[PDB]
Amino acid sequence: GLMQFTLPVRLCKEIELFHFDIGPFENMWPGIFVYMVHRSCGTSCFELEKLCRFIMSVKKNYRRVPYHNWKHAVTVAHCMYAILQNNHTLFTDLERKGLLIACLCHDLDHRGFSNSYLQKFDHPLAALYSTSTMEQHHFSQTVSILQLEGHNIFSTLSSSEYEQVLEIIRKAIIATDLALYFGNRKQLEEMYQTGSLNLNNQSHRDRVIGLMMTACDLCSVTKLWPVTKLTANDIYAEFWAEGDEMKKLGIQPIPMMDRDKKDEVPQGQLGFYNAVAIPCYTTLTQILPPTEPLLKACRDNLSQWEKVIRGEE
Numbered sequence: 001g002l003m004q005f006t007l008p009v010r011l012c013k014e015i016e017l018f019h020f021d022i023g024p025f026e027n028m029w030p031g032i033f034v035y036m037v038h039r040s041c042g043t044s045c046f047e048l049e050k051l052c053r054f055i056m057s058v059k060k061n062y063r064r065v066p067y068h069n070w071k072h073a074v075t076v077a078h079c080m081y082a083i084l085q086n087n088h089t090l091f092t093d094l095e096r097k098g099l100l101i102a103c104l105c106h107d108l109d110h111r112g113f114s115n116s117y118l119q120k121f122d123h124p125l126a127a128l129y130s131t132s133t134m135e136q137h138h139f140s141q142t143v144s145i146l147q148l149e150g151h152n153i154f155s156t157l158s159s160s161e162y163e164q165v166l167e168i169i170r171k172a173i174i175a176t177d178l179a180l181y182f183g184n185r186k187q188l189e190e191m192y193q194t195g196s197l198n199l200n201n202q203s204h205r206d207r208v209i210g211l212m213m214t215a216c217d218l219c220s221v222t223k224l225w226p227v228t229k230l231t232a233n234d235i236y237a238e239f240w241a242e243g244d245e246m247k248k249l250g251i252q253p254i255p256m257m258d259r260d261k262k263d264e265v266p267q268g269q270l271g272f273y274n275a276v277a278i279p280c281y282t283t284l285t286q287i288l289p290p291t292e293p294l295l296k297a298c299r300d301n302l303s304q305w306e307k308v309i310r311g312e313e
């Protein structure tokens with residue numbers, strides 16, 4: 001109860017900012033997370049011994065892939081933390097609890113492959129879940145770890161609250177399926193502009209949490225340029241590995257994933273910023289004005305990629 005986590009002055013200050021980078025020291029990430037959970041929810045909301053055990057089990061169940069790894073997990077959790085801290089009064093006690101957990105677990109057991117690769121490979125998980133295949137697997141993994149002994153960090157919740165919070169987590173994790181983003185943002189836009197968006201409508205909160213999850217998930221595009229630029233190497237390293245596996249199944253992969261088409265990455269990023277990222281953070285800013293820094297930072301990077309194409313780097 002009286003064991004407050006603290007951080008070095010630079011991290012103490014720089015962690016409250018959206019563009020924070022959690023650094024190269026793996027061993028500090030658990031403490032960074034607990035710090036955020038405390039500041040974002042309360043010193044009280046989780047039992048420290050249970051939390052740490054949960055944190056470490058979740059870490060053990062991320063894999064050593066170039067991008068969809070433990071560092072991504074914590075990065076995504078941090079973006080959410082920022083959003084929650086800049087929208088203090090908008091969210092319930094359970095929402096602040098479940099969402100940070102949802103983000104930590106959102107890519108549990110990821111192997112670096114898209115849902116499509118599993119379909120075409122005919123992976124057994126694809127049999128079990130036709131849509132949002134990895135995301136239903138990520139949620140399922142979260143439930144496993146939650147049921148290990150000494151791991152129920154929600155043990156003080158009533159039966160009801162427990163079910164609510166696990167439903168927050170489930171919907172939140174499903175929403176990281178980007179195929180579902182496009183519709184979700186379309187609807188939030190029309191609801192916002194036609195004035196009908198309404199945060200007492202649970203059906204509407206669900207959608208809004210979905211968009212926050214897309215925002216947090218994509219948040220490497222909202223970092224300072226050198227962090228964004230370097231993360232890109234990792235994202236594309238998984239892509240090209242998948243392309244390879246596609247070619248192995250006798251299927252020319254889309255150029256995004258073809259490592260013989262490395263030269264098209266800059267134009268590919270442009271496309272993605274215009275087609276995906278900029279819309280995401282625009283709409284999110286409209287719904288949640290204080291998240292504007294994500295939009296700004298995203299635009300800055302879009303400009304930086306334009307500069308790559310023009311040979312200015």
Ligand SMILES: O=c1ccn(-c2cccc(OC(F)(F)F)c2)nc1-c1ccnn1-c1ccccc1
Nearest residue numbers: 178217218219220221232235256268269272276
């Ligand atoms: O830099 C990028 C370039 C292309 N894509 C991407 C991913 C999936 C489908 C897609 O094309 C679509 F289907 F949308 F048209 C494009 N994502 C990123 C990116 C940036 C940050 N995260 N992130 C990412 C990575 C992997 C998975 C989900 C997001």
Ligand SMILES: [Mg+2]
Nearest residue numbers: 106107134176
């Ligand atoms: Mg994912």
Ligand SMILES: [Zn+2]
Nearest residue numbers: 106107176217
């Ligand atoms: Zn992710």
